[PDB]
Amino acid sequence: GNPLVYLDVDANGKPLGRVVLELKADVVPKTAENFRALCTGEKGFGYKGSTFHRVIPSFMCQAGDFTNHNGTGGKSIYGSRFPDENFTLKHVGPGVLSMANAGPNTNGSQFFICTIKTDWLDGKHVVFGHVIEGMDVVKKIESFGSKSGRTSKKIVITDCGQLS
């Protein structure tokens, strides 16, 4: 079935808890597989050790720049970037998991979890999953953000992987 993956997140090396995500491989298989493998680290790189570097309250928590740790980097398992698979899933509310990008057909590894309905991002960002458990952890992450996206603590994905 659809993969279940997890992110264990700390704030300054203190655990916040676990976010479990369902990846909608039934709808966006290529995008789901990219994220799944970056969670396991099975290609030799991925999310473990990377940070939620851009967190904006009442908007979203963005992570996944595991190369540059600032929003300029990341890589897909396929290559530097891969195309927008489809825009079938929409930014319907909090808990939506979606790909960050630098314009059309530039998906890499950066992703975000919405904390509100971000419907102005429909048709530009590929939605590929949602939070199954740990929205309380997402709200903890959000509380360390700011209007500019700067975080007041270092929010690290200290472990991540696949549950099923």
Swiss-Prot record:
One of its GO terms (molecular function) is peptidyl-prolyl cis-trans isomerase activity. GO terms for cellular component: cytoplasm; membrane; mitochondrial matrix; mitochondrial permeability transition pore complex; mitochondrion. Residues 6-162 form the PPIase cyclophilin-type domain. It is an enzyme of class 5 (isomerase). Associates with the mitochondrial membrane ATP synthase F(1)F(0) ATP synthase; the association is increased by inorganic phosphate (Pi) and decreased by cyclosporin A (CsA). Interacts with ATP5F1B; ATP5PD and ATP5PO. Interacts with SLC25A3; the interaction is impaired by CsA. Interacts with BCL2; the interaction is impaired by CsA. Interacts with TP53; the association implicates preferentially tetrameric TP53, is induced by oxidative stress and is impaired by CsA. Interacts with C1QBP. Interacts with MCUR1. It comes from Homo sapiens (Human). This is Peptidyl-prolyl cis-trans isomerase F, mitochondrial. Its main location: mitochondrion. PPIase that catalyzes the cis-trans isomerization of proline imidic peptide bonds in oligopeptides and may therefore assist protein folding. Involved in regulation of the mitochondrial permeability transition pore (mPTP). It is proposed that its association with the mPTP is masking a binding site for inhibiting inorganic phosphate (Pi) and promotes the open probability of the mPTP leading to apoptosis or necrosis; the requirement of the PPIase activity for this function is debated. In cooperation with mitochondrial p53/TP53 is involved in activating oxidative stress-induced necrosis. It catalyses: [protein]-peptidylproline (omega=180) = [protein]-peptidylproline (omega=0). It comes from the Eukaryota. Changing residue 160 to S: Blocks Ca(2+)-induced mPTP opening and reduces hydrogen peroxide-induced cell death. It is found in: Mitochondrion matrix. GO terms for biological process: apoptotic mitochondrial changes; cellular response to arsenic-containing substance; cellular response to calcium ion; cellular response to hydrogen peroxide; mitochondrial depolarization; mitochondrial outer membrane permeabilization involved in programmed cell death; necroptotic process; negative regulation of apoptotic process. The modification N6-acetyllysine is found at residues 24, 124.
